[PDB]
Structure formats: C-alpha cells, structure tokens
C-alpha cells in the first residue's frame, strides 16, 4: 500500500 512502511 502507498505510504505504509516509510511512516
């Protein structure tokens, strides 16, 4: 999913 994990 886009944006989930670099948060």
């Amino acid at each position, epitope marked *: *999913a*886009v*944006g*989930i*994990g*670099a*948060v």
Partner: antibody
Amino acid sequence: QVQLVESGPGLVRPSETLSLTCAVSGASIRTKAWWSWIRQPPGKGLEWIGYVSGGWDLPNYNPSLKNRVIILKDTSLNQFSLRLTSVTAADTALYYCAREGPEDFDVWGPGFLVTVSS
Amino acid sequence: DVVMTQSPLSLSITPGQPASISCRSSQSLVHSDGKTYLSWYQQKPGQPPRLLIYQVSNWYSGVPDRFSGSGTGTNFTLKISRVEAADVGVYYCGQGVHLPRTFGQGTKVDIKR
C-alpha cells in the same frame, strides 16, 4: 483505464547496466501512488525491486539488490525508469512495472523479459 | 525481511469442492492505522498477476465473490469456493505494510478432471 508498458533492451551484456522504462497512461504520475518495479525469474517467485513515489518522499529499494538499483521518475514524459548496475545472469528475469496504490498493487504491466548473456 | 510462507506449494483441486491456501508471516501485518495489509494475487501463465484481494477480506473491483480471504495477525487463508476451469495458475500472498515488500513463493494450482 490505467495502462503501463515496459520498454528497453531484451539483451544486456553482463557487468553492464540494465535500463528499463515504464510508460504510464490513464493517470498522472504525480498522484498518491508508489510506482514500483518487481522482477520474477521465469517459473519462480516474485522479487520486489523497489518504488519511486508520486509525491516528494524518497525512494526505497530492496536491500537484496546490494545498492545496485536506481529508480527514477520523469513527470514531463509521465514515465518512470529502472537502472540496475553490474548485472549478472541472476538478473535475467521478467520485469513488471506496477502501481502500489491506496488498495495495493492496482495495475501491472504485461512484463518484459530481460536476458543477461553475451 | 518479513518472510511469507505459503502452504501447500502445490494444490490440486477436486471439481465441485472448495480449495484452501494458507499464508503465514514472520511478523504481524497489523499497521498502526488499525488496518491489516495483506493481499492475494492470481497469475495465469505468460501474463502479470491479477489483484484479487487487498485488506484480507476486501475484493478488488471485478473479482467474483467465490474468492474469499480470512485470517488475523500472521495467519491468512484464501478459499476458492467453487472453481472454474480458468482458475489454474500460481497464487501469491503479499504484505504491503512492511519494507521491503515481500511475497510468498507461490502456490501452483492445477485441477483434477
């Protein structure tokens, strides 16, 4: 209506650099999406290579690639491209360009077969 | 990496019967936003995978209800309730919450006839 197409060479010499370009139509590259490259050696599993963001956040790549991967995006041409340096026979595979979106990988390209041979 | 393990690696389905693939992760796929980011893809030969399920039980647009996903935490299960002939191919589970992104090795589905 979103379609992605990979283009480039089908043959690259070893130790050289593999360049692949994914052209996106049906949506602007400057959206809330991670434009990603994933490879699959024929008849085997999927290896996630990495992504470049449609926003301003930095790209992230797979540590298994040993700092050989650069993923770039070009808004003016509405495309994104993969550069993979110092290729070996292990890098011979099918390369898919995809869009990781608000759901998950929404759309995949048909796949492009790159063979590393002299 | 978050290691994804599928079981079984080769699954022959019997007509008129249901079929079940399991996918287990080395870490929880629960994100801080409360959602679970697990996805199921189907890959027929010579073409890219198709997105079937994201968010273990939500169906992607155009995917039939006969494909179903269940599970919590590290245990996930994809069931094909009543198969079609077209449904042969390789099925993958993938987590979209942890970096690097990871997929299962894939379960090859062939039909009995």
